[PDB]
């Protein structure tokens, strides 16, 4: 069943620099040795990204807005982050999407889930055999009226408690599809997202077609002999963190190398130099002066001035005339 | 389904024979937009949506691009750039009863027009006047839905018609819904005509040395034209060059 967790330190949210992260392949077309200009929903360069912690005492799994699409990144070594919940009211009154990577299978379902106020998974540590096993799945109370279901091939997670693994995702809800892009890279940082460029390849286009305005991240708890108490307080968490940014209708210049891999990109609305680079369709600019855009002052008010008359037009006497 | 609450069926990963439907004698309306009704079996789509509902005969004309009216505006709206086929038939022997069939509703009032493929199934009281209704119908406060009340003795314009709209999705994505066309052997190093999962053209097919990513289906050159494809059966990457040409 559902249980509310307690014993958490009331800290403020942290923020990080998105740098040049969050760029993905806009389509499924092979291109090489070319600079391609595209307009799509991308994470703006050097944007303000909300930084969530799960360390010990924090276990951040709030419900966040989805807006026009979400950039999600996780940095961890113990696989605390398992999945996400997407939807509107996030309860049994509406269709919602649940994506969870559990110890043996990845499950994607769309149902009228009655999600927990504080949903999570849990792994128990058994000192008797020094093994970690998944024992809890407390995400929802019920899951009726399912319209979509997918389960991946079986596997085994180590689930060992302990940053080594950086996992970046892009979530788009558009044209009847829930599009997921992802990239898995090594990381040696414990403070923030790395500085460098990496393009995210498409993972799956889910033929769902539901309304998503809010989402939350599903984290796994660790329970051991060192965590006495009840299901609400008798827990800890392996060090982990994740970042959430939002996508914007931005124009990007993407650089494809010989192998057709995107190796760089320019955010055309980041600054006047990037704007120049996009204008010239080049990642370099020669000495000189270039016209790249136009300046225009925008209106701040809307002024409507009609004749000050109150009498209504005699249409009714035409429509309800005794004789035509 | 009722037209105000039309039912959408998603069709994918299958062979779509549209000649069975088109050459049928059982349909009174079969109008295709953005596509020829006799070329459908030569095409591949990324998805097909079959939207089914019941309206009365006179309203069948509203199920089209560029139409207005109670159905076009408040129930089922098709986009001006709609690609697909609108199929309808008389169902007076199914959806009508003695005394009137009141199980088929339509939206009569709405604050604004629907967007293309928008489905509004609310029953909130419509405010016609300047005074808030507060959920209570009465003067200038209307219940937004109305029934057709289909009867077997109605004239054709008031008889029920079952409408199925097949919208054809064309994204830059792997096509999953193809007509029943028989494939041929792959021929390389010759000038041939070709059709790769809906992608047609003329040229010479050769083994490609381009390292496509696992998700990429075709490539393009600096002209933004196809210069390579992934064979849908072998997953072999093929380069496409134009057949020898030049001035004389």
């Amino acid at each position, epitope marked *: 069943q559902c249980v509310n967790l307690t014993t958490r330190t009331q800290l403020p949210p942290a923020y990080t620099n998105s740098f040049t992260r969050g760029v993905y392949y806009p389509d499924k077309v092979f291109r090489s040795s070319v600079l391609h200009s595209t307009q799509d929903l991308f994470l703006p360069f050097f944007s303000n990204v909300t930084w969530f912690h799960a360390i010990h005492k924090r276990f951040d799994n709030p419900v966040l807005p989805f807006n026009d699409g979400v950039y999600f990144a996780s940095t961890e070594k113990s696989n605390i982050i398992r999945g996400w919940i997407f939807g509107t009211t996030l309860d049994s009154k509406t269709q919602s999407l649940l994506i969870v990577n559990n110890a043996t299978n990845v499950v994607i379902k769309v149902c009228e889930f009655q999600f927990c106020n504080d949903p999570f998974l849990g792994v128990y540590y058994h000192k008797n055999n020094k093994s970690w096993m998944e024992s809890e799945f407390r995400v929802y109370s019920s899951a009726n009226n399912c319209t979509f279901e997918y389960v991946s091939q079986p596997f085994l997670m180590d689930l060992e408690g302990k940053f080594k693994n950086l996992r970046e995702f892009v979530f788009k809800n558009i044209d009847g599809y829930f599009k997921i892009y992802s990239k898995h890279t090594p990381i040696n940082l414990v403070r923030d997202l790395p500085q460098g460029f990496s393009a995210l390849e498409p993972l799956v286009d889910l033929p769902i077609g539901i309304n998503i305005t809010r989402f939350q991240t599903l984290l796994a708890l660790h329970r051991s002999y060192l965590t006495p108490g009840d299901s609400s307080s008798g827990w800890t968490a392996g060090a982990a963190a994740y970042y959430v940014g939002y996508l914007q209708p931005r124009t990007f210049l993407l650089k494809y190398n010989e192998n057709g891999t995107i190796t760089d990109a320019v955010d055309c609305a980041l600054d006047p130099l990037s704007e120049t680079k996009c204008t010239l369709k080049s990642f370099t600019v020669e000495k000189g002066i270039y016209q790249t855009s136009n300046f225009r002052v925008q209106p701040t008010e809307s002024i409507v001035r009609f004749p000050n008359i109150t009498n209504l037009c005699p249409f009714g006497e035409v429509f309800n005339a005794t004789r035509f | 389904a009722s037209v105000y609450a039309w039912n959408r069926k998603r069709i994918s990963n299958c062979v779509a024979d549209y000649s069975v439907l088109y050459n049928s004698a059982s349909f009174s309306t079969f109008k295709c937009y953005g596509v020829s009704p006799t070329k459908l079996n030569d095409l591949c789509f990324t998805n097909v949506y079959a939207d089914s509902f019941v309206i009365r005969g006179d309203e069948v004309r509203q199920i089209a691009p560029g139409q207005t009216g109670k159905i076009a505006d408040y129930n089922y709206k098709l986009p001006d750039d709609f690609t697909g086929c609108v199929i309808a038939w008389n169902s007076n022997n199914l959806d009508s009863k003695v005394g009137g069939n009141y199980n088929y509703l339509y939206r009569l*009032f709405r604050k604004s027009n629907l967007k293309p493929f928008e489905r509004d199934i609310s029953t909130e009281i419509y405010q016609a006047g300047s005074t808030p209704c507060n959920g209570v119908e009465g003067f200038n*406060c209307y219940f937004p839905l109305q*029934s057709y009340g289909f009867q077997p003795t109605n004239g054709v314009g008031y008889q029920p018609y079952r409408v199925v709209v097949l919208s054809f999705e064309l994204l830059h994505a792997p096509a999953t819904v193809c007509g029943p066309k028989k494939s041929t052997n792959l021929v390389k190093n010759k000038c041939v005509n070709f059709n790769f999962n809906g992608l047609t053209g003329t040229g010479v097919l050769t083994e490609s040395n381009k390292k496509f990513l696992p998700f990429q289906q075709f490539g393009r050159d600096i002209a933004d034209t196809t210069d390579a494809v992934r064979d849908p059966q072998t997953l072999e990457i093929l380069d496409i060059t134009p057949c020898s040409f030049g001035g004389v």
Partner: nanobody
Amino acid sequence: VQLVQSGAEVKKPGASVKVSCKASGYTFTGYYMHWVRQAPGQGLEWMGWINPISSGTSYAQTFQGRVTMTSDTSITTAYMELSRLRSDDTAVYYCARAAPFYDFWSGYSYFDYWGQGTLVTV
């Protein structure tokens, strides 16, 4: 257009009576169904109406709290149930058809069709 009501009823004070009205010849849900009472030697008194499409109702302050109107579109029949009957509720009850409030030419302002009166004695 026809409106056919149930037969006459005799009830004791404190009892409830349910008078039905079966409609035909028109789209049942396209009109409001009104009930009008006529006590012996008296004129016509409006009681209220029901809108079969939603079963929304409205009642005169005189009957509000005592009368409940319902309908069933599958048999195109309207019902009026008057509870806590008193001796002064002896009257002939009529069902009558009128346009809905959205009728452009104010067909709701009057009753164009009436059923046969049903006498209820209390």
